[PDB]
From a paper:
The archetypal Type II AAA+ protein NSF (N-ethylmaleimide-sensitive-factor) plays an essential role in eukaryotic trafficking through its disassembly of different SNARE (Soluble N-ethylmaleimide-sensitive factor attachment protein receptor) complexes. After fusion, NSF—together with several molecules of an adaptor protein, SNAP (Soluble N-ethylmaleimide-sensitive factor Attachment Protein)—binds to the cis SNARE complex, forming the so-called 20S complex and disassembles it in an ATP-dependent manner.
Regarding substrate loading, both FL-20S classes reveal a spire in which the N-terminal end of the SNARE complex is positioned over the D1 ring by two αSNAP molecules, each of which is in turn bound by two N domains. While both FL-20S classes show clear density for the spire, its orientation varies by a discrete rotation (if viewed from the D1 end, counter-clockwise) about the hexamer axis as well as a slight translation in the hexamer plane away from the split in the D1 ring in each. In the second class, the N domain is shifted by one protomer counter-clockwise about the hexamer axis, with domains B and C engaging the first αSNAP and domains D and E engaging the second (right). This difference results in a 53.2° rotation of the αSNAPs and SNARE complex about the hexamer axis. Finally, and most important, density consistent with the N-terminal residues of SNAP-25A runs from the tip of the SNARE complex to the center of the D1 ring, where it assumes an extended conformation at a 61.0° angle relative to the plane of the D1 ring. This interaction is preserved in the FL-20S-2 reconstruction as well, with a slight difference in the unstructured region of SNAP-25A running between the structured region of the SNARE complex and the D1 pore entrance. Despite the variation in spire configuration between these classes, there is little difference in the interaction between SNAP-25A and the D1 pore or in the overall configuration of the D1 and D2 domains of protomers A–E. Previously, four αSNAPs were found associated with all T-20S complex classes; in the case of the FL-20S reconstruction presented here, only two are present, similar to the structure of the V7-20S complex.
Author numbering:
A (entry chain H): 50 to 83, 141 to 204
B (entry chain K), F (entry chain L): 8 to 293
C (entry chain J): 32 to 89
D (entry chain D): 1 to 147
E (entry chain I): 191 to 256
The structure:
């Protein structure tokens, strides 16, 4: 999950520069077009100490992918608009042949 | 589904324009179309899973797009041509994959170069075992990823370096990587828990040292004793190291005896169990 | 025993909370995949249309 | 004897599972004739053929004791080759068998006259191939044994 | 002197059932994030090979005016 | 201006003229404007909840786009038209999904094709239940996902191949399938803890097979047998074929209840378990 959430940085890398290209490529189109129980009492507590590992990483591992959902909240609209902008710029970039 | 006649009729079309063939304008539309012709020609072999012939037929279209003035998708056509002998068993995907990175870097660029450079490294480690080359590929790739501030893959490709470079011979470049990643990992809230096993690996790497180099990093390390996860960081080492100094190889097995149960042991650490007892027996007999 | 029971019960409902997260996650993972594939063809045919453009005005 | 690839199958009924015969089809080989099943270089096992009308040509039917001796089950690739015995020093003249009831939910203490059993034994398993340690089952007065 | 053993049986098998439940929701979870994880590898092409179309194209669109 | 008017107004302009209305060109500039009218129309048919002239309008938006020069975005609109009839009541999305794969494969874009090659298998298994052809799409699509090296995509498809080999009752092929994929999971630490279950699938697929393949494929799986999911995976299986080769259905059907108490079984597993449950009874009585 760490490495896949850190891939999100290269996702950002792609989307910002594509978005950059579409603000500039916007320009060229119009420019060109127009006791074991007492051991058990310790074993159960050995695991009571382990459930610390459980609850700590549990509470921790919750928040990250929520943060990733906000990172996705970045991705979604800047992707959908860019899907629109590529197609309109492309249809313009095909109608200027003549 | 005409694979043959395309290849022959494009022979006069893979043709520069100084002739009656030239006419008025260039032949840079003809060869441009021909690239798609050879692509489709390889495509209809590929569909019949003739990948061996298909990749060589894609080498045509991928070669001819460069000829017009386009490194742009000719490198994508090399990626495509490499997918043939990558998916197909035999070689020379190695060639087109080396063609693609040099072309992307000759575009003035960095990312996709490293992206396929580790693909080459995967081939040259997993298939064509050339660790002395593929490890250098991960090294350079990680160097580019530092040049992109995706320390993500800067750390990943270096873990791929050091995990094998350690058992091979080299325990210092190893801990260099494993301290680099652990120290850059206590920074992030995403990374600090991966840093536990990273400083563990940074601690494990011994040049047959009978000293506390693992426990040395521990005396640096942020165990945070209430956090029991670092018993998989030091408590192993805490127990076995005294054994190693004080004539107790026999006691050394009883650590993995339980740690293999509370953590199923992989190849690297198990081979390291054998390797650091090669350091035992190179203190005792070897 | 009862303290430990409750302490486990914490992680129990927290597991259910992380599944309550995956109910959103799977949706996000799907819809990002829905556009990821979609953009490559719009990009390749845009490169094609621009190829038609650049040949007219050498 | 050159050896043909065969597919290990299951014994059709209980009668031939009481014969310890590598049950085959009449389409391929002949009852009485002996063969040698090969599974690997380190496993060569010898069997008696007893054809049967419900075998698929190209597959050999084996019973559970023989498979539990042969380490075989339904639908495995094996090489079956005709094997001809040497009747100079391989015809059986004296053979000890360790016997015991097969199914442990019908154990009794009744006596079974061995002279009658051994006589009916040869009357049933004549011209059959028996190796040391080979395991099978014998039917004496409608009773399952583990031989 | 047996009812506390029956609790030692019952409350702790209950506890083990809490373990079973969280471990089963976790053999869900590990596989949830597992199965999601490769979709990122599906992006892995469409994230920069997509850029390989975009920048390599607009380097031409800006040269298409010329 | 309604969606119904767009169809007939595009019908005016679709005419292939050869007159002073044409001049020298045909209607190559006009087949795009027609496609544009349908690009708006197919959009707003769904807005009126038509769902059936919707899908036909999504078809028509690309149908005329074929004749221009461009199958590609026409193909995307075929996929969209398949998203019309699919969500709608009738079929014929399945047709446009043929129309799509026959185009994207005709360039080499196997992944985009495979996005809905699987969805074709989804309709042909859920709706138009054609499980030999549905599996001919899961397995074939898995071959495409491995064409671009994505192993886990093909493991997802091949579990549809082999998962429904139980309901297709092809246990001999199911045991042929779950082996290589679990071996591909022992390598992966990302995937290992389902690998025991993967070989359990290969293990449990019995047609009353008493090969020790069932007792050996679990042995192949490198395994610390006092591990924590193995008590519910492997020794389980040994207990279950302890009773099958006992010729006893009593303990065979006691341990299945012993196990469901600790991990609730599902339709596929439980069906396979009662499939083998009939196999003991098919030999004890008769």
């Amino acid at each position: 999950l760490d490495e896949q959430g850190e891939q999100l940085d290269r996702v950002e890398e792609g989307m910002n520069h594509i978005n950059q290209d579409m603000k500039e490529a916007e320009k060229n189109l119009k420019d060109l077009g127009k006791a074991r129980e007492n051991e058990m009492d310790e074993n159960l507590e050995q695991v009571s100490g382990i459930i610390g590992n459980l609850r700590h990483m549990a509470l921790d591992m919750g928040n990250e992918i929520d943060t990733q959902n906000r990172q996705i909240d970045r991705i979604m609209e800047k992707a959908d608009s860019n899907k629109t902008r590529i197609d309109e710029a492309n249809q313009r970039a095909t109608k200027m042949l003549g | 589904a005409e694979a043959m006649a395309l290849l022959a009729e494009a022979e006069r079309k893979v043709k520069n324009s100084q002739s009656f063939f030239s006419g008025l304008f260039g032949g840079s539309s003809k060869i441009e179309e021909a690239c798609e012709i050879y692509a489709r020609a390889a495509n209809m072999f590929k569909m019949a899973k003739n990948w061996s012939a298909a990749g060589n037929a894609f080498c045509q279209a991928a070669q001819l797009h460069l000829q017009l003035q386009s490194k742009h998708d000719a490198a994508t056509c090399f990626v495509d041509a490499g997918n043939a002998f990558k998916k197909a068993d035999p070689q020379e995907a190695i060639n087109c994959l080396m063609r693609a990175i040099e072309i992307y870097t000759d575009m003035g660029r960095f990312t996709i170069a490293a992206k396929h450079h580790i693909s080459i490294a995967e081939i040259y480690e997993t298939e064509l075992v050339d660790v002395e080359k593929a490890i250098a590929h991960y090294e350079q790739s990680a160097d580019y990823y530092k040049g992109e501030e995706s320390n993500s893959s800067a750390n990943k490709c270096l873990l791929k370096v050091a995990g094998y470079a350690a058992q091979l011979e080299q325990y210092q470049k190893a801990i260099d990587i494993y301290e680099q990643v652990g120290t850059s990992a206590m920074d992030s809230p995403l990374l600090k828990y991966s840093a536990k096993d990273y400083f563990f690996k940074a601690a494990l790497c011994h040049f047959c040292i009978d000293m506390l180099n693992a426990k040395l990093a521990v005396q640096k390390y942020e165990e945070l004793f209430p956090a029991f996860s670092d018993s998989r960081e030091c408590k192993l080492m805490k127990k076995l190291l005294e054994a190693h100094e004080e004539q107790n190889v026999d006691s050394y097995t009883e650590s993995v005896k339980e740690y293999d149960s509370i953590s199923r042991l992989d190849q690297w650490l198990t081979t390291m169990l054998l390797r650091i007892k090669k350091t035992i027996q190179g203190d005792e007999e070897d | 025993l009862q303290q430990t029971q409750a302490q486990v019960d914490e992680v129990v409902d927290i597991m259910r909370v992380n599944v309550d997260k995956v109910l959103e996650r799977d949706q996000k993972l799907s819809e990002l995949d829905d556009r990821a594939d979609a953009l490559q063809a719009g990009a390749s045919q845009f490169e094609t249309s621009a190829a038609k453009l650049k040949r007219k005005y050498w | 004897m050159a050896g043909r690839s065969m597919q290990a199958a299951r014994c059709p009924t209980d009668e031939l599972s009481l014969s310890n015969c590598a049950v085959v089809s009449e389409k391929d080989y002949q009852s009485g004739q002996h063969v040698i099943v090969r599974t690997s270089p380190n496993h060569k096992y010898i069997f008696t053929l007893r054809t049967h009308p419900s075998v698929v040509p190209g597959s050999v039917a084996f019973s559970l004791p023989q498979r539990k001796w042969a380490g075989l089950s339904i639908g495995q690739e094996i090489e079956v080759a005709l094997y001809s015995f040497d009747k100079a020093k391989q015809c059986i003249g004296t053979m000890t068998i360790e016997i015991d009831f097969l199914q442990k939910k019908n154990i009794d203490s009744n006596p079974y006259d061995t002279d009658k059993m051994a006589a009916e034994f040869i009357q049933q398993f004549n011209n059959q191939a028996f190796s040391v340690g080979q395991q099978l089952v014998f039917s004496f007065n409608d009773k399952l044994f583990g031989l | 002197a047996l009812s506390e053993i029956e609790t030692r049986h019952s409350e702790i098998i209950k506890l083990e059932n809490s373990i079973r439940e969280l471990h089963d929701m976790f053999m869900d979870m590990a596989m949830l994030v597992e199965s999601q994880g490769e979709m990122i590898d599906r992006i892995e092409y469409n994230v920069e090979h997509a850029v390989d179309y975009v920048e390599r194209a607009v380097s031409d669109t800006k040269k298409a005016v010329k």
